[PDB]
């Protein structure tokens, strides 16, 4: 099994850190904005099967957003990432979903990640609001923190299980 995954969402929400945490099990606080598009490999196991995840990390800066839609085509699962400390990043999730509907596969698996859940002092988006938006769209949701290692592994395994489940049915 080889699943192509894609991380999208506004600049600064933590996509690169989420990927670094899942692949390197580390956090580096001095990351630069992604000027391009990168991917990393991470293998997991489900139902006694080895699943290779090829995870693409996008540039969230406005000027690259149109260019970046080219890379949605192969995606089997997409993480929609916002920053719990930034209401604008959350508002924009509906716009990211429209992008997925337009440029990705109609049967792509999606998941919403409310990242930086370690910064509750600067929280702008309540967990209930995140949960309700996910519910509205019929997609899974969780809060993550690449810094504190909260739910990152759980998110990715959950997305891959959904993809695998769908594929086995056919």
């Amino acid at each position: 099994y080889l699943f192509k995954l894609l991380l999208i969402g506004d600049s600064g929400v933590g996509k690169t850190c989420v990927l670094f945490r899942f692949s390197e099990d580390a956090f580096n606080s001095t990351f630069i904005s992604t000027i391009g598009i990168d991917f990393k490999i991470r293998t997991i196991e489900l139902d006694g099967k080895r699943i290779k995840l090829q995870i693409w990390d996008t540039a969230g800066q406005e000027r690259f957003r149109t260019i970046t839609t080219a890379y949605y085509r192969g995606a089997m699962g997409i993480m929609l990432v916002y920053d719990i400390t930034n209401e604008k990043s959350f508002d924009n999730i509906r716009n990211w979903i429209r992008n997925i509907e337009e440029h990705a596969s109609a049967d792509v698996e999606k998941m919403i990640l409310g990242n930086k859940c370690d910064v509750n002092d600067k929280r702008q988006v309540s967990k209930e609001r995140g949960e309700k938006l996910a519910l509205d769209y019929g997609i899974k949701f969780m809060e993550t923190s690449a810094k504190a290692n909260i739910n990152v592994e759980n998110a990715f395994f959950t997305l891959a299980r959904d993809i695998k489940a769908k594929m086995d049915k056919k």
Binding site: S23, I35, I37, K40, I41, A59, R63, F64, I67, A70
Partner: protein
């Protein structure tokens, strides 16, 4: 679980370059006057890599007519460094729209590694209608 040695190896052996610069500003571009801005790339990976500028979205060419990259493709051994020049030359095909204003001195180049990642380079600046 146990250590993901296979993943570590496969990631470490993915193509990689270091770019000296990714944002380029061409100030006061004039008609039929050549401007050049250079930057360096190095293969900081473990494997040889083929690089090339590629069209974006559904474009025919990798960049606008007034712009070129030289070289625009090549093959780099690990640890090898090469210079690339970004060349701006506005001829009479580009002026109609640069004087009109329905085109400005802006572009994005996508540098692609075969079987690897892409780097975005941003071009900005201004044209002075001759």
């Amino acid at each position: 679980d146990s250590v993901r040695i296979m993943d570590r190896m496969e990631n470490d052996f993915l193509p990689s370059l270091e770019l000296s610069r990714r944002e380029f500003v061409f100030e006061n571009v004039k008609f039929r006057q050549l401007q050049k801005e250079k930057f360096q790339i190095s293969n900081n990976g473990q494997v040889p890599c083929h690089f090339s500028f590629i069209p974006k979205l559904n474009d025919s060419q990798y960049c606008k007519p007034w712009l070129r990259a030289e070289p625009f493709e090549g093959y780099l051994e690990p640890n090898e460094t090469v210079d690339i020049s970004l060349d701006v030359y506005v001829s009479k095909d580009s002026v109609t729209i640069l004087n009109s204003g329905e085109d400005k001195i802006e572009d994005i180049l996508v540098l692609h590694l075969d079987r690897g990642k892409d780097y975005f380079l941003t071009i900005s600046g201004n044209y002075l209608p001759s």
